[PDB]
């Protein structure tokens with residue numbers, strides 16, 4: 001795999017090794033708020049993270065993942081548009097080189113500074129690798145970040161990043177509560193889509209929260225000090241690791257709220 005976010009290996013090149021990049025349900029997308037229809041049949045989300053067990057934080061060369069114990073139903077997402085139970089496996093972010101870009105989804109073409117993805121897999125498929133082969137295999141909860149006041153629940157993440165500066169580095173990251181990354185409201189938009197990085201599999205029910213979280217300039221500046229490169233290689237700052245909006249095609253975005 002030699003895909004990335006550079007001019008020579010970025011999103012416009014991905015289709016050559018991953019032809020599904022030009023598929024019928026690719027993500028992210030622009031959320032046109034006036035065209036999304038309230039669906040009164042959608043249920044409230046059930047975010048049940050009380051028993052979450054975080055384990056480790058990894059710089060994988062594309063972002064950093066906070067990984068969870070998903071060998072039992074400890075942190076799960078249910079309800080909303082979902083049938084059944086989806087286990088939290090990891091979260092990560094996408095962010096920009098400046099505050100005016102970074103998110104993958106957009107809202108009436110507005111780009112946020114960053115976007116958090118809480119990744120969950122449908123337990124009816126037994127493991128994540130099986131789930132990604134199914135149209136309802138994953139549920140990703142997407143949360144926009146804007147720059148303003150600090151997010152206290154993000155600080156423990158920010159302060160460990162110095163220890164995973166380069167690709168392949170990891171660190172213990174136990175006892176982290178992902179509930180501190182949520183906004184107050186769970187109002188959301190939802191639509192069927194894909195992974196936003198290769199292999200771009202069309203296996204995701206996207207649930208994008210309407211309310212952004214606020215993070216401080218200092219917090220996002222620390223994201224931007226990470227490296228795409230490995231240790232002992234010339235520095236390539238980990239910034240602009242977002243895929244732009246893709247064609248909506250034959251899909252409808254539904255809103256949980258009027």
Ligand SMILES: NS(=O)(=O)c1ccc(CCN(Cc2ccco2)C(=O)CN(CCC(=O)O)CCc2ccccc2)cc1
Pocket residue numbers: 001002003004006008009010013014015016017018
């Ligand atoms: N899956 S895809 O999107 O369709 C996709 C896959 C491959 C490429 C080409 C990658 N390119 C262009 C590039 C991209 C960024 C800069 O230059 C390279 O030059 C190859 N080279 C650096 C690629 C890399 O690892 O970044 C690695 C091979 C190599 C050989 C010998 C010694 C060391 C390394 C582009 C897109």
Ligand SMILES: NS(=O)(=O)c1ccc(CCN(Cc2ccco2)C(=O)CN(CCC(=O)O)CCc2ccccc2)cc1
Pocket residue numbers: 058060117119127128129130132140194195196197198199
């Ligand atoms: N931005 S996004 O849309 O939210 C989004 C985009 C990409 C991914 C990546 C998913 N991938 C790559 C992948 C795997 C299969 C297809 O694709 C992995 O997680 C790979 N992982 C190893 C590297 C690692 O995780 O350390 C193993 C996953 C696994 C396989 C089998 C059983 C259990 C777990 C997640 C969310």
Ligand SMILES: [Zn+2]
Pocket residue numbers: 092093094117196
């Ligand atoms: Zn993501």
